[PDB]
Amino acid sequence: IVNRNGHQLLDTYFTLHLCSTEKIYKEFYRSEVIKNSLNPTWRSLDFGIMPDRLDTSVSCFVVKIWGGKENIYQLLIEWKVCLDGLKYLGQQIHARNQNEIIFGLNDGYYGNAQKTILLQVDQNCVRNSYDVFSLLRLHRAQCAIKQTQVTVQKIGKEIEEKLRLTSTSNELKKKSECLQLKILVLQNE
């Protein structure tokens, strides 16, 4: 998980965090901001939920753009960066790049994970299990989550129950006739 702010935009939609079409996917998403497509502008893309506090924690990253109304309608920059360069508090990382027009690429670093980390810290010296109560209460919380997954699986099965019958059956136009009939009586009278 991670929390921060993205600090620019490139096209209303631009190239995803990754794709299975060349390796494995990471979200295609868009922030709609618009400008001219062959000479200067320097727009922005924004959210609270896009710069969310949950996240895939880390990657050695690839910057790709796409789109840009219809005047651009296509890619605009290609770049790469191992992410330790963009540290989490105030810790700016930056570019200037220009695959069809110049853009001084600006991004701000103004403001299971825990489990795996704990293992490492445990391994780092001579140590005990101490207050294992904490683990008991945690497994109970895990269970509340597991219940939820099962609930989702039940809903998964429920979803097809009526859909077979719904796909199975048309009467449909039957309604329009009685509706017209109800209207016609009244109008005629």
């Binding site: 299971n112 489990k115 299990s129 294992v132 497994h139 895990q142 597991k146």
Partner: peptide
Amino acid sequence: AAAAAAAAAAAAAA
């Protein structure tokens, strides 16, 4: 699901 099982397995592996 694996993380909840890994919690239990880890508490065993401790």
